[PDB]
Amino acid sequence: AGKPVLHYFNARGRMECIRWLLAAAGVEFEEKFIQSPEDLEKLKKDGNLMFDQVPMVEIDGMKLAQTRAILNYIATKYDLYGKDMKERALIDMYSEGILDLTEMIGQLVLCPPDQREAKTALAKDRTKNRYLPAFEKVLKSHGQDYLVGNRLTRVDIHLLEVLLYVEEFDASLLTPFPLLKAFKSRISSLPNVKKFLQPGSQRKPPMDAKQIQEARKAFKI
Amino acid sequence: AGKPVLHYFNARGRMECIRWLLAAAGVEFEEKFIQSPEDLEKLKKDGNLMFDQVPMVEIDGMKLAQTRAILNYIATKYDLYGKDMKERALIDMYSEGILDLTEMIGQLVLCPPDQREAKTALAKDRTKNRYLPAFEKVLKSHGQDYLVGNRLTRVDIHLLEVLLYVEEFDASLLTPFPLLKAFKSRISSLPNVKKFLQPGSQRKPPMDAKQIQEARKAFKI
Ligand SMILES: N[C@@H](CCC(=O)N[C@@H](CS)C(=O)NCC(=O)O)C(=O)O
Ligand SMILES: N[C@@H](CCC(=O)N[C@@H](CS)C(=O)NCC(=O)O)C(=O)O
């Protein structure tokens, strides 16, 4: 095969971080969108999904499922996983923290009006007092342009991506962090990244209250 | 330093998969248990926890947090991560499915009482119709003793461990799967595993009801 094929709904979800990593690596990919329960059913019946779930990416002869397994394979393949196990330990701990932040904010648009109020307050609290400070500290610790090993790795991309989501959430959360503001602007200028950020790329938008309801009355939800 | 130091509550939680990997690898470790919230607070205040969370393991000079980061580092260090990136893709995909299954069962203990029965029936349904069939198939596909690469890897250990929890959950779920029954017995006989399974090892038991709430009437949440 030529281009990796990404199987997922036409939405951000768990596949967006993979789109970002391939984009950053400069690797062109195709997407086969799951538009209906029938598309999903067919994917399962034809033996495409190990645990009957997506994300699933066809690459180098594999039908690879599980977000993290896919990200790990792609980062290794395109030299975005650092130079050794020690740098990989830092890249992994940092990336896992970013995934947790992403989920904590991402779950909000699901909270029952009686729950969201406090959950949002907790997320903003965690964002400005737990996560942003941790990454601002990493940058401050070595004063280098990238998070690990003074060279671009997958986690610089994951961090840029989640900062964008933090900005969509509450732009003010980011103000106390000068080093993250600089980092965000630096990574966004990389050629491959700038191209993904441009209108018309395969980058996905966030989903508005209604929009989602559809997807519920679109599949099991 | 010397032995790895594991920072966690005196319970299974997210640290158990890590205790299991080190035991299988024949690596001796120490544990510093978090007995009270005052214990946890100190760990945070002293800056040893990147995101003020545990599991955290002191190994090779690092204060490594995030379960998956720790597991990936330990697996690579002790040659339990396969031989190449393709093997690691399968290892990762399989392990993520195991982690998902583990969480699905484990979280039941936290369900609001009015949701627990529905949640439990789903977890049982997923266990017998999605996860166990998927792993039985991997073993049947190549007919070999191990899941990946015809050689012991971290995921063989992850699978033995989650098979034990499935047995605790509902032993009847495991009866229709012959190759998994055989796999379980086989991995259980390896020297280092048999020793971890024996009484008096650092392996952890499930928490009981009173214990679950008591641990609640103990910390925050
Ligand atoms: N831990 C898996 C979770 C995947 C997952 O939950 N996929 C959902 C949509 S996000 C799915 O495909 N559900 C269909 C089904 O369970 O039948 C991963 O990160 O890839
Ligand atoms: N995604 C993290 C989750 C860590 C986590 O939730 N740790 C909990 C106990 S299992 C904690 O330390 N909570 C204390 C706090 O949030 O203040 C990991 O896998 O290591």
Whether chain B has a CB inside 8 Å of the CB on A198: the answer is no
**Ligand 1 atom closest to A66 (CA):** 20
Q: How far apart are the first and last CA of chain B?
A: 34
Which SS3 state, helix, strand or coil, does residue A63 take?
strand
A206 HSE (CA, 13 A, CB side): 16
- What letter would DSSP give residue A219? B
- Under CATH, what is the fold of the domain A81-189? Glutathione S-transferase Yfyf (Class Pi); Chain A, domain 2 (1.20.1050)
B189–chain A nearest CA distance, Å: 28
Nearest to A97 among B60, B66, B73 (CB): B66
From residue B86, alpha-carbon distances to A183, A206, A210, A219 in Å are 33, 33, 41, 33
Among candidate residues A154, A171, A42, the one with its CA nearest the CA of residue A93:
A154
Nearest-by-CA chain B residue for A76:
B85
Among candidate residues A2, A124, A98, the one with its CA nearest the CA of residue A59:
A2
Whether chain A has a CB inside 8 Å of the CB on B55: the answer is no
Nearest to A66 among B62, B85, B93 (CB): B93
Among candidate residues A62, A35, A41, the one with its CA nearest the CA of residue A53:
A41
Distance, CA of B188 to CA of B197 (rounded, Å): 8
Enumerate the domain spans of chain B: 1-80+190-208, 81-189
B92 CB near ligand 1 (under 6 Å): no
Residue whose tokens read 């779950």: A107
Q: B77: CA distance to ligand 2 center in Å?
A: 24
Asked if residue A69 lies in contact with residue B96, where contact means CB atoms within 8 angstroms, the answer is: yes
Which tokens in the block code for residue B33? 């248990």
CB atoms under 10 Å from CB of B68, counted, come to 22
Beta strands in chain B (DSSP E): 5-9, 30-34, 56-59, 62-65
Query: CA A28, A33, A39, A44 torsion: positive or negative?
Result: positive
Which SS3 state, helix, strand or coil, does residue A217 take?
strand
Obtained via which technique?
X-ray
Does the beta-carbon distance from B86 to A51 stay under 8 Å?
no
Host H or E run for residue B73: helix B67-77
Does the beta-carbon distance from B62 to A86 stay under 8 Å?
yes
Distance, CA of B139 to CA of B144 (rounded, Å): 6
**At CA A18, angle to CA B85 and CA A157, rounded to 5?**
95
φ/ψ bin of B31: left (φ > 0), alpha (ψ from -120 to 50), beta (otherwise)? beta
A56 CB near ligand 1 (under 6 Å): no
Distance, CA of A63 to CA of A1 (rounded, Å): 12
Task: Sort out which chain A residues have CB atoms less than 8 A from B64's CB and list them.
Answer: 89, 93
Among candidate residues A176, A155, A21, A151, the one with its CA nearest the CA of residue A101:
A155
CB atoms under 10 Å from CB of A38, counted, come to 9
Distance, CA of B181 to CA of B140 (rounded, Å): 12
Among candidate residues B18, B217, B14, the one with its CA nearest the CA of residue B102:
B14
Distance, CA of B101 to CA of B132 (rounded, Å): 10
Distance, CA of B81 to CA of B153 (rounded, Å): 6
Q: Which of B100, B102, B129 to mutate to test the pocket of ligand 1 (most atoms within 8 A of CB)?
A: B100
A73–chain B nearest CA distance, Å: 6
Distance, CA of B23 to CA of B25 (rounded, Å): 5
From residue A195, alpha-carbon distances to A203, A205, B209 in Å are 10, 16, 54
Query: Is-cis flag, bond preceding B112, omega within 30?
Result: no
Q: Do domains B1-80+190-208 and B81-189 have the same CATH topology?
A: no
Pairing of the two strands B5-9 and B56-59: antiparallel
**Amino acid (one-letter) located at A81:** Y
Judge residue A208's burial from the number of C-beta atoms within 10 Å of its C-beta, 0-12 exposed, 13-18 middle, 19 or more buried.
exposed
Residues 78-117 on A with a CB inside 8 Å of B are 85-86, 88-90, 92-93, 95-97, 100
Asked if residue B20 lies in contact with residue B157, where contact means CB atoms within 8 angstroms, the answer is: yes
Which tokens in the block code for residue B10? 């005196």
- CB within 8 A of B61, min separation 6: which ones? B1
Which SS3 state, helix, strand or coil, does residue A47 take?
coil
**At CA A180, angle to CA A168 and CA A125, rounded to 5?**
55
Whether chain A has a CB inside 8 Å of the CB on B31: the answer is no
Alpha helices in chain A (DSSP H): 16-25, 37-45, 67-77, 85-106, 116-126, 132-142, 154-169, 178-188, 191-197, 209-216
Does the beta-carbon distance from A89 to B97 stay under 8 Å?
no
Among candidate residues B178, B55, B158, the one with its CA nearest the CA of residue B100:
B158
Does the beta-carbon distance from B92 to A77 stay under 8 Å?
no
Host H or E run for residue B95: helix B85-106
Which tokens in the block code for residue B95? 């392990």
Task: Sort out which chain B residues have CB atoms less than 8 A from A118's CB and list them.
Answer: none
Distance, CA of A71 to CA of A53 (rounded, Å): 16
Query: CA A157, A158, A162, A163 torsion: positive or negative?
Result: negative
Asked if residue A74 lies in contact with residue A21, where contact means CB atoms within 8 angstroms, the answer is: yes
Residue whose tokens read 């952890």: B204
Distance, CA of A49 to CA of A42 (rounded, Å): 10
Distance, CA of B68 to CA of B66 (rounded, Å): 6
Does the beta-carbon distance from B65 to A93 stay under 8 Å?
yes
Longest dimension (CA), chain B: 51
Looking at the domain that runs over A1-80+190-208, which CATH code has it been given?
Answer: 3.40.30.10
CB atoms under 10 Å from CB of B127, counted, come to 21
Which tokens in the block code for residue A91? 């890249």
Q: Which of B53, B95, B102 to mutate to test the pocket of ligand 2 (most atoms within 8 A of CB)?
A: B53
Q: B53: CA distance to ligand 2 center in Å?
A: 4
Asked if residue A14 lies in contact with residue A158, where contact means CB atoms within 8 angstroms, the answer is: no
Helix/strand/coil (H, E, C) string of B179-194?
HHHHHHHHHHHCHHHH
- What letter would DSSP give residue B34? E
- CB within 8 A of A16, min separation 6: which ones? A161, A203, A204
A66 CB near ligand 1 (under 6 Å): yes
Which tokens in the block code for residue A167? 């900005």
